[PDB]
Amino acid sequence: ARVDQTPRIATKETGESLTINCVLRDTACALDSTNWYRTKLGSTKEQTISIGGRYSETVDEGSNSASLTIRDLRVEDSGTYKCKAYRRCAFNTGVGYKEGAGTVLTVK
Numbered sequence: 001a002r003v004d005q006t007p008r009i010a011t012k013e014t015g016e017s018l019t020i021n022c023v024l025r026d027t028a029c030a031l032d033s034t035n036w037y038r039t040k041l042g043s044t045k046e047q048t049i050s051i052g053g054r055y056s057e058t059v060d061e062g063s064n065s066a067s068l069t070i071r072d073l074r075v076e077d078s079g080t081y082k083c084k085a086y087r088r089c090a091f092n093t094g095v096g097y098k099e100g101a102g103t104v105l106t107v108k
Contacts, residue, residue: 001026003085005100012073012107020103022083024064029096032088034066041078041106075107 004023012018024031034057036049051057054071066085070077081103087096 001029001098003083003098003100005083005103007103008101010103010105012105014073014075014108016073016107017069017071018073018077018103018105019067019069020081020083020100021065021067022085022100024085024087024098026064026087029087029089030061031064031066031085033086035084035086036068037082037084038077039080039082040076041080041104043079046082073105073107078105078107080104 002025004025006021010018022034036051037046038049039046049055056069058067058069059065066083068081068083083100085098087098089096
């Protein structure tokens with residue numbers, strides 16, 4: 001019904017971590033799944049990130065949330081990052097997947 005993504009902007013130094021939090025604010029539906037997308041800074045190409053290695057996802061059922069952690073940051077990680085939240089509602093197959101408004105990360 002609305003995804004709150006935070007932080008909206010970030011400036012890291014190489015080697016730092018960023019954690020982006022996506023809360024699915026909905027009194028009716030569960031955040032079932034999430035995917036994570038990166039658009040490299042200056043590009044217009046969106047890519048889905050496969051979670052693993054220095055990319056991790058933390059899930060919190062009580063808060064209806066998913067967080068992406070990116071460790072060992074590199075200048076090439078600079079980009080716009082977004083989550084897409086899939087939903088499990090009390091009913092059926094309905095119009096779901098809501099998006100975060102984005103994080104703008106700059107590294108070094």
